[PDB]
């Protein structure tokens, strides 16, 4: 148990480059979500 | 109601008024509801009829009659129980449909759109 | 159009580099690949 | 802390609580 | 930590005889009300019986709480906490488990 | 009183001890005076 | 045994949006200005 | 899972078998 | 059971008494009270009349 | 070899979703549009609807919940609404084998022709599935054999076609040992005259072994004005009993001679109900009343009286199939009836009859809590 | 309550006295009602006599007495009548001593709107009206169909008119908290007047949502919970359950440092600033200790009213995102408050027979002293709802219906959950509500059964 929950590694996205935004709490036209919401959605992507 | 819009969009009519509408001409479908303040099931129909109105704005006339105020008319129109609706067509050759009971919103839409 | 960086590591990362290159924002990644675990022990009934 | 000390020194069931039937008709560990 | 004491709804035991006692006190009180009406007792007297019957019932119940715990459920969480001295007072417990 | 009077305490309280005593009585582990457990019998169970 | 007051009265679905035009809510509130204008207490700019 | 919503009452079955299955 | 001090016995010979029922009252304490206070209660009428 | 143990009951009629059959006029009325005020009428009800009864489908769902086995006989269309109803019943465990499905008729809809010739006249072109079933094949003889009670309501007598079928069904049940229960539940057209109604319902009454009528219905049938005059008699100088000194509601017991205009030889029992407040019973050898209560104000925002009548009829049927000495012993009948009053009380505490029809365990617990131990 | 023609207040009462209608609700002046007998009991008692002779407790002339049902004039019928909004938001209040209730109403007022919001499993039902009347929601002003939706605006089109409704994005409040509205209506939908269109902060689906639902155990743990302290898991930190956004404003009247400043010298939008940095160019405005955030906006506001054109005000607004930390205060709705003392990795947390690890651990010696048995009822019902997918809204004082009503609800629901999802530990017949759990560090069972729930 301690090894399974604790000693196994994984891969994830760590930094994102959005080209033309003032900050993360802004908003952009044509997209229903703010930059903060897009960033949260990315934190949930699974990779191998 | 210039500045404040009225909350309720279905209006109470009377036996004489219903008769004029029937004998005269119409171009959109007519739905008549018979109700009483006392019936418990009716509280639920009212909410549904108000939604149908928002959806079909000038493409239908939804009107209401109270049994306490017009009991004899109801008997003549053959109403056997309280939650009852009459759907009447703009064409005068076609038959009218009477529905008894609480019936779902989709059924109401289907009758208006297909049968009437 | 967005640019992303991916890594393999263990545990979880605090978003330490708040200071950043223009347009780059970090996300706190959790790198743990196992959601849950359980175990049970029962008797084989072998007597002595 | 007091709860723990009480539990350690609380003790054990003595008679009816530990044996169902009278011990007459019929503890073990000895340590050095 | 190892023993892990915790408190639950059914660990708040009540003395076995409470129902019988509350039921009897209520009978006495009804009979006295019929009699005030019929003229056999005065008002200062009704008031007094009511305060007094209820105080006795509450107090007997409090007195009997500890014997019940020590004889029938020695290791209950509520007893351990109070007897130890850790937290709780008899009055505080009486309110959770008596009247 | 000549006519029985209503009370909120007319019915016996439901409990874990009564359920268990009944169940064990069917099995034959305990014999009880009667078919329904009494309040003294329930008290002894809590002890043993 | 089963509860005398039915538990259905208590249950609400986890993903529900409340309908405010339902039998247990007060009539919809009116903007003060509009109400006051409807009843004539405040007059418009054109009228002055 | 349409099967879940078909009940034996609908598929005609003789009485003795029906009563037994429902048992 | 015994009742040596001035006591009020509330039962009569041959009465069946159940367990935990108050049969008598000792009233042992006999102390004058300086906390004595005289108070007034008012009875009120439940119907109209003479 | 023998049939399954809890005996079976058959409910015959039309399945309608939430329909209240009885409509008369009420002096008190609330706002036309604001429905948040209409609850007040449930708190203080117009009298005819203190315990509103309902469609035959509802009685079956309640019987199963209170323990018991029921079967529903009728026709519904192969349309969408029809399928929903059968699903509901199947899910609630009501036997649905005797339900017939038709492809040419549609549930809940009747085609009418509106003609004005100096008067408003409506005539019926086609009829609803519910009101169109035929003797020939719509009747499952197997269900009829096992059944020990047949339950019908008066709506069936308002359609020509179902009227013919009802009579074939009554006859077949009696052959196989059945007992018939007529729960009247009068519809709106039948409240016009005592004379027109007595004639229309006559054949059905005489072929019935157990009958349930409301207080307002019984008076309608016999001397309605005479009863009204009686309840407004207030004595001039002195009261004759201490009861009249206290200004309380009337609960008159109808004497056996008064009900003689309506008795017949094959009537085992007659029940007259005044909400859940009183239930009067009449038998060939004995008479009496069972006291009850009602508390709709304990839950003011979730109170609806819509299925309470269906529930009282169901508790009666459940106890009658199981306890057979009810017919001959007065005390047993009374004790047993207190269970039915309880079912009704709990059915007034939820919105919608099908939601909130009580279960057997709950009903016993309320009987035990409300009544003293000796009575229960 | 309402205010009368004269200054006096008025409480509604129902007349049970026989009259034609037989009932009406009336509002009574503080003086008038001392002269009527008012009862709050119910009519569920019958003996060999009739209902009218049965007795009930009642108030008359500023006193409490017992009288027959015949002699009562008015009855009090509403559930929430004797209490205010805060006390009416506590579940199972009947089982909590009143002293605590004061504390509890006070603590709800101190809650912080969180970044993502979630509704409660157990509630009282007044959360719905509290949201309608707050002003944080967008409700329709006319009926119509939704024609366009964008994060900034909603268009409603009703009978030949189009109405635009503005929305609030990331705005400050008087107490440095954030306000943000999120849409609840899909395009193409019909709405009636008064229906919800958008949700505000601390509101989900039309109800007030000031906190989160977490798995908890009540047991002693190595002293970390001494007095009133809490031990928590790291999941809360890395899955962001308790993160909040805080916005502050700094304003003025008109080496590495100065990197941010623009041509006019005002810090640009999107800059990350730290203590010391100049915000607006001797007369420089600089950051205090502990403020470090993105500069969400700058406003050069021209002003009028002063003798001179009012010194133009330059305002800077800065946002800090804050996660749960040692030292924060957390509380439940029943008067229970504590400060976080340690965060531990999931592996070391106590765990259940399902394998899952508890999020928080609370001391169990607190309930006897503080007299709140409400929490035990709420934790247990929460576990059931999560498993069975139900939310429960229960009004206060349920024992009016029957004795021990709450126990019957909680125990029954726990059993259903145990049967439907086959977890036998959820209802244990020997000790209902408690289970046996294990230690993360060693794998060994703790000796006595413990209370587990989601409050
Ligand atoms: Zn409670």
Inter-chain residue contact K413 with G2, CB threshold 8 Å: no
**Selected residue of J338, J373, J374 to mutate for chain F interface (largest F Cβ count, 10 A):** J373
What element of type H or E holds A17? strand A10-18
Both structure tokens of J297: 């104000």
User: CA dist D28 to B100, C21, D13, K140, K207, Å?
Assistant: 83, 74, 15, 80, 64
User: CA dist E49 to B85, E42, E52, J57, Å?
Assistant: 66, 11, 5, 57
- Is the separation of the CB atoms in K142 and K193 below 8 Å? yes
Please give the method by which this entry was determined.
cryo-EM
Determine the straight-line distance between the first and last CA of chain A, rounded to whole angstroms: 22
Q: Is J328 left (phi over 0), alpha (psi -120 to 50) or beta?
A: alpha
Q: Are strands A10-18 and C2-9 parallel, antiparallel or unpaired?
A: antiparallel
**Which of K145, K191, K193 is nearest residue B7 as measured by Cβ atoms?**
K193
Report the alpha-carbon distance of residue K370 to residue K385 in Å, rounded.
27
Report the alpha-carbon distance of residue B5 to residue K330 in Å, rounded.
45
Both structure tokens of J129: 């599935």
- Is the separation of the CB atoms in E43 and I43 below 8 Å? yes
Both structure tokens of K206: 């039309």
Closest to F48 in 3D by CA, of D9, K446, E74: E74
The C-alpha torsion from J142 through J147 and J153 to J159, rounded to 10°, is 20
- Is the separation of the CB atoms in J98 and J72 below 8 Å? yes
Q: Could you tell me which residues come within 8 angstroms of residue J87 by beta carbon, excluding any fewer than 6 positions away?
A: H5
Residue with tokens 């023609």: K5
Closest to J101 in 3D by CA, of J128, J79, J124: J79
User: What count of residues does chain F have?
Assistant: 48
- What 3-state DSSP class applies to J272? strand
- Report chain J residues whose CB lies below 8 A from the CB of K78: 300
What count of CB pairs under 8 Å joins D to E? 16
Report the alpha-carbon distance of residue F9 to residue K402 in Å, rounded.
11
Closest to J352 in 3D by CA, of B110, B44, K147: B44
How many Cα atoms occupy the beta-carbon half-sphere of K444 within 13 Å? 9
Burial class (CB in 10 A: 0-12, 13-18, 19+), J372: middle
Report the alpha-carbon distance of residue I49 to residue E15 in Å, rounded.
50
- DSSP-based helix, strand, coil % in chain D, nearest 5: 25, 0, 75
Closest to J152 in 3D by CA, of J180, J171, J172, J176: J180
Both structure tokens of B89: 């067509």
Closest to K296 in 3D by CA, of K228, K264, K248, K262: K248
For the annotated catalytic residues of B, the residue numbers are 39, 42
Q: Residue C9 CA to chain centroid, in angstroms?
A: 8
Both structure tokens of I21: 């029922």
Residue with tokens 């007529």: J182
Phi then psi for residue J196, to 5 deg, are -65, -45
Report the alpha-carbon distance of residue E15 to residue F43 in Å, rounded.
10
- Is the separation of the CB atoms in K359 and K242 below 8 Å? no
The C-alpha torsion from E65 through E71 and E74 to E78, rounded to 10°, is -10
Please count the other Cβ atoms lying within 10 Å of the Cβ belonging to residue B19: 15
Q: What is the DSSP code (8-state) at residue C34?
A: -
- Is the separation of the CB atoms in B4 and B35 below 8 Å? no
- What 3-state DSSP class applies to J182? strand
Determine the straight-line distance between the first and last CA of chain H, rounded to whole angstroms: 24
- Say yes or no: F2 contacts chain J, CB-CB below 8 A: no
Q: Residue B83 CA to chain centroid, in angstroms?
A: 11
- Is the separation of the CB atoms in J41 and B37 below 8 Å? yes
User: CA dist J86 to J57, J82, J96, J98, J303, Å?
Assistant: 10, 7, 7, 11, 27
Q: How far is K79 from chain J (nearest CA, A)?
A: 8
Report the alpha-carbon distance of residue F8 to residue K402 in Å, rounded.
9
- What 3-state DSSP class applies to J155? helix
Q: What is the DSSP code (8-state) at residue J261?
A: G
Please count the other Cβ atoms lying within 10 Å of the Cβ belonging to residue B9: 17
Q: Residue J255 CA to chain centroid, in angstroms?
A: 23
Three-state SS for chain E is: CCCCCCCCHHHCCCCCCHHHHHHHHHHHHHHHHHHHHCCCCCHHHHHHHHHHHHHHHHHHHHHHHHHHHHHHCCCCHHHHHHHHCCCCCHHHHHHHHCC
Alpha-carbon Rg for chain C in angstroms = 22
Report the alpha-carbon distance of residue J83 to residue J99 in Å, rounded.
11
Strand ordering across the sheet containing K310-322 = K244-253, K310-322, K293-303, K272-273
Both structure tokens of E96: 């959770």
Both structure tokens of J185: 């539940």
Report the alpha-carbon distance of residue K239 to residue J198 in Å, rounded.
75
Residue with tokens 């030292």: K327
**Which of K149, K170, K345 is nearest residue A25 as measured by Cβ atoms?**
K170
**Cβ density class B77-113: b for 16+ within 10 Å, e for less:** bbbbbbbbbbbbbeeeeebbbbbbbbbeeebbeebbe
- Is the separation of the CB atoms in K11 and K1 below 8 Å? yes
Burial class (CB in 10 A: 0-12, 13-18, 19+), J174: middle
Closest to J62 in 3D by CA, of J16, J21, J93, J87: J93
Q: Could you tell me which residues come within 8 angstroms of residue J141 by beta carbon, excluding any fewer than 6 positions away?
A: J172
Q: Is B75 left (phi over 0), alpha (psi -120 to 50) or beta?
A: alpha
- What 3-state DSSP class applies to J90? helix
Q: What is the DSSP code (8-state) at residue H4?
A: G
Q: What is the DSSP code (8-state) at residue J222?
A: S
- Is the separation of the CB atoms in K186 and K102 below 8 Å? no
Tell me, in angstroms, the distance from the centre of ligand 1 to residue B64's CA: 44
- Report chain K residues whose CB lies below 8 A from the CB of J295: 42-44
Q: What is the DSSP code (8-state) at residue A47?
A: B
User: CA dist B114 to A22, B29, B33, K168, Å?
Assistant: 54, 11, 20, 44
Inter-chain residue contact E80 with D6, CB threshold 8 Å: yes
Closest to K119 in 3D by CA, of K452, K414, K373, K392: K392
Phi then psi for residue E10, to 5 deg, are -95, 10
- Report chain F residues whose CB lies below 8 A from the CB of E19: 9, 12-13
Q: Could you tell me which residues come within 8 angstroms of residue K56 by beta carbon, excluding any fewer than 6 positions away?
A: K39, K41, K66, K67, K68, K69, K72
- Say yes or no: J3 contacts chain H, CB-CB below 8 A: yes
Q: Could you tell me which residues come within 8 angstroms of residue C19 by beta carbon, excluding any fewer than 6 positions away?
A: K272
Phi then psi for residue K447, to 5 deg, are -65, -40
Please count the other Cβ atoms lying within 10 Å of the Cβ belonging to residue E99: 14
- What 3-state DSSP class applies to J258? coil
**Cβ density class J237-261: b for 16+ within 10 Å, e for less:** eeeeeeeeeeeeeeeeebeeeebee
**Cβ density class I10-37: b for 16+ within 10 Å, e for less:** eeeeeeeeeeeeeeeeeeeeeeeeeeee
Q: Which chains touch D (3 or more CB pairs under 8 A)?
A: E, F, K
Three-state SS for chain K is: CEECCCCCEEEEEEECCCCCCCCCEEEECCCHHHHCCEECCCCCCECCCCHHHCEEEEECCCCEEEEEHHHCCEECCCCCCCCCCCHHHCCCHHHECHHHHHHHHHHHCCCCCCCCCCCCCEECCCHHHHHHHHCCCEECCCCEEEEEECCCEEEEEECCEEEEEECCCCEECCCCCEECCEECCCCCCEECCCCEEEECCCEECCEECCCCCCCEEECCCCCCCCCCEEEEECHHHHCCCCCEEEEEEEEEECCCCCCCECCCCEECCCCEECCCCEEECCCCEECCCCCCEEEEEEEEEEECCCCCCEEEEEEEEEEEEECCCCCCEEECCCCCEEEEEEEECHHHCCECCCCCECCEEECCCHHHHHCECHHHHHHHHHHHHHHHCCEEECCCCHHHCCCCHHHHHHHHHHHHHHHHCCCHHHCCCCCCCEECCECCCCCCECCCCEEEECC
Q: Could you tell me which residues come within 8 angstroms of residue B82 by beta carbon, excluding any fewer than 6 positions away?
A: B34, B35, B36, B39, B41, B42, B67, J19, J20, J23
Report the alpha-carbon distance of residue K197 to residue K141 in Å, rounded.
10
Q: Could you tell me which residues come within 8 angstroms of residue J92 by beta carbon, excluding any fewer than 6 positions away?
A: J61, J64, J65
Q: Residue K157 CA to chain centroid, in angstroms?
A: 34
Determine the straight-line distance between the first and last CA of chain E, rounded to whole angstroms: 33
Q: Do chains H and E touch (3 or more CB pairs under 8 A)?
A: no
Closest to J19 in 3D by CA, of B82, B47, B43, B33: B82
Report the alpha-carbon distance of residue F10 to residue F4 in Å, rounded.
11
Residue with tokens 């405010």: G20
Residue with tokens 């493409």: B59
Q: How far is K192 from chain B (nearest CA, A)?
A: 7
Q: What is the DSSP string of B42-110?
A: HHHHHHHHHHHHHHSSSS-EEEEEETTTTHHHHHHTT--SSSEEEEE-SSSSSPEEEEES---HHHHHH
Q: Which chains touch K (3 or more CB pairs under 8 A)?
A: A, B, C, D, E, F, G, J
- Is the separation of the CB atoms in J181 and J149 below 8 Å? yes
Q: Which residues in I have their CB inside 8 Å of a CB on E?
A: 20-22, 41, 43
Q: Are strands B61-66 and B30-35 parallel, antiparallel or unpaired?
A: parallel
Report the alpha-carbon distance of residue A35 to residue A21 in Å, rounded.
8
Report the alpha-carbon distance of residue J154 to residue J187 in Å, rounded.
7
Report the alpha-carbon distance of residue D23 to residue D15 in Å, rounded.
9
User: CA dist J142 to H18, H21, J61, J104, K199, Å?
Assistant: 11, 16, 21, 26, 59
Question: Can you say whether the dihedral through the CA atoms of K362, K368, K370, K371 is positive or negative?
Answer: positive
- What 3-state DSSP class applies to F39? helix
Report the alpha-carbon distance of residue J155 to residue J166 in Å, rounded.
11
Report the alpha-carbon distance of residue K189 to residue B55 in Å, rounded.
9
Closest to K313 in 3D by CA, of K248, K252, K250: K252
User: CA dist B116 to B87, B94, I15, K161, Å?
Assistant: 7, 8, 86, 29
């Amino acid at each position: 148990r301690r090894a399974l929950l604790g000693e196994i590694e994984g891969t994830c996205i760590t930094r994102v480059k959005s080209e033309k935004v003032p900050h993360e709490y802004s908003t952009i036209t044509g997209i229903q979500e703010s930059v903060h919401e897009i960033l949260m959605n990315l934190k949930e992507i699974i990779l191998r | 109601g210039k500045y404040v819009r009225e909350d309720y969009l279905v209006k109470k009519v009377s036996a004489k008024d219903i008769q004029e509408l029937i004998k005269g001409e119409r171009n959109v479908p007519l739905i008549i509801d018979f109700y009483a303040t006392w019936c418990g099931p009716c509280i639920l129909m009212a909410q549904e009829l108000e939604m149908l109105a928002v959806e079909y704005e000038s493409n239908a006339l939804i009107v209401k009659v109270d049994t306490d105020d017009e009991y004899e008319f109801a008997r003549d129109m053959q109403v056997r129980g309280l939650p009852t609706l009459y759907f009447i067509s703009p064409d005068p050759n076609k038959d009218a449909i009477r529905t008894e009971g609480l019936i779902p919103i989709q059924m109401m839409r289907d009758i208006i759109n297909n049968d009437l | 159009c967005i640019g992303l960086q991916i890594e393999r590591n263990r545990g979880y990362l605090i978003k330490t580099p708040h200071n950043f290159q223009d347009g780059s924002y970090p996300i706190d990644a959790v790198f743990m690949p196992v959601r849950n675990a359980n175990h049970s022990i029962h008797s084989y009934g072998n007597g002595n | 802390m007091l709860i723990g000390l009480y539990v350690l020194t609380s003790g054990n069931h003595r008679g009816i609580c530990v044996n169902r039937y009278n011990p007459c008709n019929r503890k073990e560990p000895f340590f050095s | 930590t190892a023993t892990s004491i915790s408190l639950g709804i059914d660990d708040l035991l009540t003395i076995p005889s409470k129902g019988w006692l509350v039921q009897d006190a209520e009978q006495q009180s009804l009979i006295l009300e019929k009699h005030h009406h019929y003229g056999n007792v005065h008002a200062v007297e009704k008031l007094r019986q009511s305060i007094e019957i209820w105080y006795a019932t509450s107090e007997y119940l409090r007195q009997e709480m500890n014997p019940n715990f020590r004889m029938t459920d020695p290791f209950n969480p509520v007893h351990i906490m109070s007897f130890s001295g850790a937290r709780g007072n008899a009055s505080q417990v009486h309110q959770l488990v008596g009247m | 009183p000549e006519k029985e009077q209503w009370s909120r305490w007319q019915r016996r309280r439901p409990d874990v001890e009564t359920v268990f005593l009944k169940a064990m009585a069917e099995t034959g582990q305990v014999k009880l005076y009667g078919d329904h457990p009494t309040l003294t019998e329930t008290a002894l169970y809590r002890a043993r | 045994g089963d509860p005398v007051y039915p538990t259905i009265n208590y249950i609400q679905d986890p993903d529900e949006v409340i309908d405010y035009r339902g039998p247990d809510f007060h009539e919809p509130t009116p903007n003060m200005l509009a109400y006051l204008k409807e009843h004539g207490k405040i007059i418009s700019r054109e009228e002055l | 899972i349409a099967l879940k919503s078909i009940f034996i009452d609908q598929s005609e079955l003789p009485s003795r078998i029906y009563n037994c299955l429902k048992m | 059971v015994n009742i040596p001090p001035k006591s009020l016995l509330l039962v009569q010979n041959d009465q069946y008494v159940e367990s935990e029922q108050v049969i008598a009252e000792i009233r042992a304490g006999i102390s004058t009270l300086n906390f004595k206070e005289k108070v007034r209660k008012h009875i009120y009428s439940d119907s109209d009349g003479e | 070899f023998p049939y399954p143990n809890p005996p079976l009951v058959i409910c015959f009629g039309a399945a309608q979703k939430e329909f209240v059959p009885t409509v008369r006029v009420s002096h008190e009325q609330m706002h036309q549009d604001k429905y948040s005020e209409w609850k007040m009428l449930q708190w203080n009800p117009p009298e005819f609807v203190r315990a509103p009864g309902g469609p035959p489908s509802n009685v079956a769902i309640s019987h199963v919940r209170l323990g018991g086995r029921a079967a529903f006989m009728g026709k519904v269309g192969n349309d969408e609404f029809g399928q929903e109803m059968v699903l509901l019943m199947n899910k609630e465990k009501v036997q649905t084998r005797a339900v017939k499905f038709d492809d040419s008729m549609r549930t809940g809809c009747t085609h009418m022709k509106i003609k004005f010739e100096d008067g408003k006249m409506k005539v019926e072109k086609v009829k609803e599935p519910a009101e169109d079933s035929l003797s020939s094949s719509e009747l499952n003889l197997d269900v009829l054999k096992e059944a020990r009670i047949f339950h019908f309501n008066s709506e069936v007598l308002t359609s020509s076609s179902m009227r013919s079928t009802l009579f074939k069904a009554i006859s077949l049940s009696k052959k196989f040992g059945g007992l018939v229960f007529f729960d009247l539940n009068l519809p709106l057209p039948l409240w016009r005259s005592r004379d027109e109604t007595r004639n229309l319902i006559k054949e059905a009454w005489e072929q019935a072994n157990i009958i349930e009528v409301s207080r307002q219905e019984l008076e309608f049938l016999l001397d309605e004005e005479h009863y009204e005059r009686k309840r407004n008699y207030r004595p001039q100088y002195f009261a004759e009993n201490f009861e009249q000194t206290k200004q309380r509601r009337d609960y008159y017991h109808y004497t056996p001679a008064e009900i003689a205009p309506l008795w017949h030889d094959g009537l085992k029992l007659l029940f007259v109900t005044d909400g859940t407040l009183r239930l009067h019973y009449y038998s060939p050898s004995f008479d009496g009343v069972v006291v009850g209560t009602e508390d709709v104000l304990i839950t003011p925002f979730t109170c609806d009286r819509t299925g309470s009548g269906d529930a009282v009829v169901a508790g009666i049927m459940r106890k009658l199939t199981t306890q057979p000495e009810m017919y001959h012993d007065q005390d047993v009948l009374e004790r047993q009836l207190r269970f039915a009053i309880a079912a009704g009380i709990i059915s007034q505490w939820t919105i919608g009859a099908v939601r909130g029809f009580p279960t057997e365990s709950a009903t016993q617990n309320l009987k035990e809590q409300v009544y003293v131990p000796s009575m229960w | 309550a309402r205010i009368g023609h004269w200054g006096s207040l008025e409480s509604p009462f129902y007349e049970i006295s026989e009259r034609s209608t037989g009932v009406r609700m009336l509002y009574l002046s503080p003086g008038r009602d001392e002269y009527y007998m008012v009862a709050a009991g119910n009519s569920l008692a019958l003996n060999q006599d009739i209902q009218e002779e049965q007795v009930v407790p009642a108030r008359y002339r500023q006193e409490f007495l017992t009288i027959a049902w015949e002699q009562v004039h008015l009855r009090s019928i509403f559930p929430f009548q004797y209490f205010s909004i805060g006390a009416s938001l506590i579940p199972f209040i009947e089982h909590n001593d009143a002293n605590r209730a004061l504390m509890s109403s006070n603590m709800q007022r101190q809650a912080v709107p969180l970044s993502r919001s979630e509704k409660c499993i157990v509630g009282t039902g007044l959360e719905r009206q509290a949201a309608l009347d707050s002003g944080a929601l967008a409700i329709a002003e006319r009926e119509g169909r939704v024609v366009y939706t964008n994060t900034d605006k909603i268009l409603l089109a009703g009978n030949g008119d189009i109405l635009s409704i503005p929305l609030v994005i990331y705005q400050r409040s008087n107490k440095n908290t954030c306000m943000h509205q999120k849409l609840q209506v899909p395009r193409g939908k019909c709405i009636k007047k008064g229906q919800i269109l958008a949700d505000g902060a601390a509101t989900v689906g039309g109800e007030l949502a000031l906190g989160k639902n977490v798995l908890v155990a009540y047991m002693p743990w190595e002293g970390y919970n001494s007095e009133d302290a809490v031990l928590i898991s790291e999941r809360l930190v890395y899955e962001d359950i308790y993160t909040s956004f805080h916005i502050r404003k700094y304003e003025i009247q008109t080496a590495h440092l100065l990197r941010n400043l623009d041509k006019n010298g005002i810090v640009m939008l999107g800059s990350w600033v730290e203590t010391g940095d100049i915000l607006v160019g001797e007369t420089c405005l600089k950051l205090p200790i502990g403020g470090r955030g993105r500069v969400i906006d700058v406003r050069w506001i021209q002003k009028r009213g002063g003798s001179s054109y009012n010194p133009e005000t330059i305002r800077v607004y800065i946002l800090q995102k804050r996660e749960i930390k040692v030292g924060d205060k957390v509380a439940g709705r029943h008067g229970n408050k504590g400060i976080i003392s340690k965060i531990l990795p999931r592996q070391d947390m106590p765990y259940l027979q399902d394998g899952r690890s508890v999020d928080m651990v609370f001391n169990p010696l607190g309930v006897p002293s503080r007299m709140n048995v409400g929490q035990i009822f709420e934790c247990s019902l929460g576990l059931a709802g999560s498993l069975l997918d139900r939310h429960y809204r229960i009004a206060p004082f349920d024992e009016r219906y029957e004795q021990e009503a709450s126990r019957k609800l909680v125990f029954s629901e726990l059993y259903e959950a145990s049967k439907q999802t086959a977890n036998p530990w959820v209802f244990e017949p020997e000790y209902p509500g408690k289970s046996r759990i294990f230690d993360g560090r060693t794998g060994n069972p703790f000796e006595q059964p413990v209370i587990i729930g989601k409050p």
